[PDB]
Design a protein around this ligand. Structure first.
Ligand code: ATP
Lengths: 142, 70, 48, 401, 102
């Protein structure tokens, strides 16, 4: 929500406010446009374009921070996973079985001038990962 | 990018909200809702929310700034 | 029926309202409403 | 001051039948309304000079923000810093000058100010409670008197009370008599009090005021009588006019004690209404009409000279008034020669105009039931039996008397 | 297809804008102005937008009113608080016409 403002004197208002000599940057500046309250008090002011300073070392350090710290990427404890999986798959199987009625009716209906349910990518990923865990189970250890 | 947009939309509703009473529905994606502060606002509803549950007065949480039905 | 239709459309098309009042004739704001008013408009505050 | 009703769209359709005159009459009326439409369609089209491409107005637009708050103008200070309070009692002594006429300054009159700087905007708003402005009506329902028939005495009385005063006061002026102000119409239900009210409403040169008796039961304690006081103020403001109160036996009834202690408080409304009607000060030039089914139940304090100068009874038409109403109603419908209205009139007693309307309508309906557009006496013979069945009275006073 | 889906998700960004208040138009005058009474706070006078013509505004309508600039947004129906509950036109009962008695 941060923003940057700068005031304009009332002496040169006869002269142009902000002499513009670049279309791309002026349009980018206008893209934020002006806020409701901003117009309510936009006068004697003219917002100035802001941007995050180039960031590589800090960017790289943060990126390394995320994997291990800001989300689960310890990579050594990275791999319930066999306890609750049965129950999660039970829920989703029952739900998909139920949802299968709506496509049935949809097909039943003629030309006549909620089948899209997906629910399969989730199962795919979850149980394929669980099966892959065999790789850790049988080789990575012992 | 599509996935990022989807997760952003889902997050939109996670922020602490303000309880209030929905008044009525004008048209899809729009409605009138009365807050616990008593004022009545003209706001929008996310495509995710499902109509039959919205139709009855019932109770609903609004975005503390946008006031949109969530 | 066309008589009633014409009556309704002409009652719509009258538009002789303009209940716009409150202003003073341009003989007093001549030296008044010109600068000081708006020159104090922001500075001259309000006390409860 | 103000003006009244603006309906009356040529009440001269006098063939009243399928004749080429009414084809010629109404097409003349179509011609003048299309042209008056075309007169305002091109009126603005001519003279492009749209307020001299604009001037002065810009100042009022810029000085006053888009939203204008309102408040009560309190004690005035010559330096333009008159005290004003918002709706929440936000009293603020604040300046008040723009291109704004500073002559309509009074304590207690609504004033407009700026949202942000609270400076007085200008347009001292001139409006009242919308609960009353809605009551104002300018559309005469139907014909004035021709429809009504037989009440020569009652129509004469009401005319003398209302119409004659605002037509020729020469007699009143020379003789010094003030015309009567209050009139209370009473009688058995359906006698047509409402009919006569509409009748006068159709030929009232002044603005008409309409109110139902059970309209001053404002939920909040107090308030209420303020409603009626403001109503009378409004009516007085808008030039001479007549205030009509239907079913008055809902706000004043015998003024009996609270008894159970519920404090209905309607008594307070009645007392304030009575005060406004006649107490201290002067009413002004405003006429009052009251209609009710039961009058005795009204408390005496409301009903007395200076408040209801006339009490007009509306009795059941016996024969002549009955015949008048009967054939007046039947006129606008095709009827057969064999029909004998006088026969039915004599045959039945204790019959009111509402019943005449109902019986004629039912006879027409029965005839349509038979698939005959034309009616017959037998149609009325069946209709008067069907309609007059709900009424069953008479104690066993069939032998002793 | 999925560029379209992305565009729709982006356009869902309009949810950021705060909603407008609701006010019953006490009375609309000429010159593009109407005095309205919002429920929480006393009445005031506002200017109308360009979407809706003045004549459409009549006393006692619920206008959706801009939150920031106090400019007219829209008009809304159904100014009936509990009585619509008694309207109960929906939920038609059985077609008992045939099975009525003699
Ligand atoms: N003598 C008559 N001549 C013509 N029409 C009549 C006559 N008597 C009654 N009517 C019609 O029948 C209607 C029935 O009576 P009305 O509805 O006026 O009842 P009321 O009790 O006199 O008045 P209110 O309805 O205000 O209590 C009249 O309003 C009028 O339209």
């Amino acid at each position: 929500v941060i923003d940057a403002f700068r005031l304009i004197n009332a002496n040169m208002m006869v002269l142009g406010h902000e002499p513009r000599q670049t279309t791309s940057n002026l349009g980018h500046l206008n893209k934020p446009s002006i806020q409701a309250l901003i117009h309510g008090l936009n006068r004697h002011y003219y917002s100035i374009t802001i941007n995050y300073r180039k960031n590589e070392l800090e960017q790289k350090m943060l990126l390394n921070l995320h994997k291990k710290s800001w989300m689960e990427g310890l990579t050594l404890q990275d791999y319930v996973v066999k306890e609750m999986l049965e129950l999660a798959k039970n829920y989703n199987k029952a739900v998909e079985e139920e949802d299968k009625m709506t496509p049935e009716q949809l097909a039943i209906k003629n030309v006549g001038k909620r089948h899209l349910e997906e629910h399969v990518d989730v199962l795919m990923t979850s149980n394929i990962v669980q099966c892959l865990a065999a790789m850790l189970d049988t080789v990575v250890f012992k | 990018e599509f996935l990022h947009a989807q997760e952003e939309v889902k997050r939109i509703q996670s922020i602490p909200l303000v309880i209030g009473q929905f008044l009525e529905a004008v048209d899809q994606n729009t409605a009138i809702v009365g807050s616990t502060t008593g004022s009545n606002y003209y706001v929008r509803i996310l495509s995710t929310i499902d109509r039959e549950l919205l139709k009855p007065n019932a109770s609903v949480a609004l975005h503390k700034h946008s006031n949109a039905l969530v | 029926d066309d008589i009633q239709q014409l009556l309704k459309k002409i009652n719509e098309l009258t538009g002789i309202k303009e209940s716009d009042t409150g202003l003073a004739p341009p003989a007093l704001w001549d030296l008044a409403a010109d600068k000081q008013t708006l020159q104090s408009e922001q500075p001259l505050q309000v006390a409860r | 001051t103000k003006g009244p009703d603006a309906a009356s769209k040529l009440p001269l359709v006098t063939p009243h039948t399928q004749c080429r005159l009414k084809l010629l009459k109404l097409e003349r009326i179509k011609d003048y309304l299309l042209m008056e439409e075309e007169f305002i369609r091109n009126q603005e089209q001519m003279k492009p000079l749209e307020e001299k491409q604009e001037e002065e107005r810009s100042k009022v637009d810029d000085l006053r923000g888009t939203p204008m708050s309102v408040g009560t103008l309190e004690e005035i200070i010559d330096d333009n810093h008159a005290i004003v309070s918002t709706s929440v009692g936000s009293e603020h002594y604040v300046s008040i000058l723009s291109f704004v006429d500073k002559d309509l300054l009074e304590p207690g009159c609504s004033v407009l100010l700026n949202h942000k700087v609270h400076a007085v905007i200008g347009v001292l708003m001139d409006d009242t409670d919308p609960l009353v402005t809605v009551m104002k009506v300018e559309k005469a329902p139907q014909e004035t008197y021709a429809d009504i028939g037989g009440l020569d005495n009652q129509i004469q009385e009401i005319k003398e009370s209302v119409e004659l005063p605002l037509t020729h006061p020469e007699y009143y002026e020379e003789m010094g008599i003030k015309p009567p102000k209050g009139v209370i119409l009473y009688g058995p239900p359906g006698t047509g009090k409402t009919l006569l009210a509409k009748a006068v409403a159709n030929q009232t040169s002044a603005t008409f005021l309409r109110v139902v008796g059970s309209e001053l039961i404002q939920k909040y304690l107090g308030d209420g009588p303020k409603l009626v006081r403001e109503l009378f103020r409004v009516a007085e403001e808008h030039a001479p006019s007549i205030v009509f109160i239907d079913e008055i036996d809902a706000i004043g009834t015998k003024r009996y004690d609270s008894n159970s202690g519920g404090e209905r408080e309607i008594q307070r409304t009645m007392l304030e209404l009575l005060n406004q009607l006649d107490g201290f000060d002067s009413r002004g030039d405003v006429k009052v009409i009251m209609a009710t089914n039961r009058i005795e139940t009204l408390d005496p304090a409301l009903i007395r000279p200076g408040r209801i100068d006339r009490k007009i009874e509306f009795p059941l038409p016996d024969e002549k008034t009955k015949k008048r109403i009967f054939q007046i109603h039947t006129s606008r419908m095709t009827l057969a020669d064999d029909v004998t209205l006088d026969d039915l009139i004599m045959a039945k007693d204790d019959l009111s105009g509402a019943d005449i309307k109902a019986i004629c309508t039912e006879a027409g309906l029965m005839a349509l039931r038979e698939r005959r557009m034309k009616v017959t006496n037998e149609d009325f013979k069946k209709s008067k039996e069907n309609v007059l069945y709900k009424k069953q009275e008479g104690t066993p006073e069939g032998l002793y008397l | 297809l999925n560029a379209k889906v992305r565009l729709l998700r982006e356009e869902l960004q309009l949810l950021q804008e705060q909603g407008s208040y609701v006010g019953e138009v006490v009375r609309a005058m000429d010159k593009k102005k109407v005095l309205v009474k919002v429920h929480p706070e006393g009445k005031f006078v506002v200017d109308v937008d360009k979407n809706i013509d003045i004549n459409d505004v009549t006393p006692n309508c619920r206008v959706a009113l801009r939150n920031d600039s106090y400019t007219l947004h829209k008009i809304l129906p159904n100014k009936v608080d509990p009585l619509v509950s008694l309207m109960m036109v929906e939920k038609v009962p059985d077609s008992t016409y045939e099975m009525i008695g003699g």
